[PDB]
């Protein structure tokens, strides 16, 4: 499926 | 455990993979004008809980009524104004309605009518994975005082010297400086003609 997301800083 | 990554201590993380809480005095946050904040390395278990306020909501509703053996009449008004528990006025909802409903019978004929107007003004504290309030809020070390970040006359809370630069921002900045408003106006109603024969 579509949408994507980032990760975080660390 | 407090602020850090890889189990090691850090002065700038958005997370709590640091050492086990010591009580020792360690540094944290950015450096402003050759100065830095220094605090005991302890947990602040209420920090996220303390960030919230109490939402308040006040409502006023009126109605006017009457009838005869051939007619009836209803007219009402409602008002609602919510400023929820997230700080500032970003949780807002104002509802206003007005209604007027009548029916009159004259013989076999009945004509009635209802007309309603609705207003709303929503303001929303936007969510998401970027520079939003809650995402920025969850990404806090267990030892960092969140409500200590609201004072913008404290340079260390200004966006350029916020304690962590990892994809998040000072939550009180985001709520005080972003915008996501909605205003709506709405009219609906009906007309009915009944005739028995």
């Amino acid at each position: 499926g579509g949408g994507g997301g980032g990760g975080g800083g660390g | 455990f407090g602020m850090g990554w890889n189990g090691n201590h850090t002065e700038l993380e958005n997370g709590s993979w640091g050492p086990r809480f010591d009580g020792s005095m360690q540094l944290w946050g950015n450096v402003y004008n050759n100065s830095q904040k220094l605090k005991p390395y302890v947990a602040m278990p209420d920090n996220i809980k303390d960030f919230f306020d109490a939402g308040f909501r006040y409502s006023n509703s009126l109605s006017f009524n009457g009838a005869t053996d051939k007619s009836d009449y209803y007219v009402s008004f409602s008002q609602i104004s919510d400023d929820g528990m997230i700080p500032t006025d970003a949780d807002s909802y104002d509802k206003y309605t007005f209604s007027a409903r009548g029916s009159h019978k004259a013989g076999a004929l009945t004509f009635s009518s209802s007309l309603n107007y609705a207003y709303q003004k929503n303001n929303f504290a936007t969510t998401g994975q970027g520079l939003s309030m809650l995402n920025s809020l969850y990404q806090t070390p267990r030892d960092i005082s969140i409500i200590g970040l609201e004072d913008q006359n404290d340079p260390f809370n200004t966006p350029g010297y916020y304690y962590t630069p990892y994809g998040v921002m000072n939550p009180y900045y985001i709520l005080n400086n972003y915008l996501n408003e909605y205003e709506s106006e709405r009219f609906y109603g009906k007309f009915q003609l009944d005739y028995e024969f």
């Binding site: - | 509802k95 309605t97 209802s114 929503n122 996501n180």
Partner: protein, 49 residues
Amino acid sequence: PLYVVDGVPLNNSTVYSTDGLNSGYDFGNGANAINPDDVANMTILKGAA
């Protein structure tokens, strides 16, 4: 379900963000506009036959 008020279909359109991942927000649905103090009776027809 189809909201029917007196008895005319009521608009029940929802206004919420189309990208819930980065700018999630929700601004209400069409039934939220009716004032509950005006309701005499509500009857929910569950079946579709």
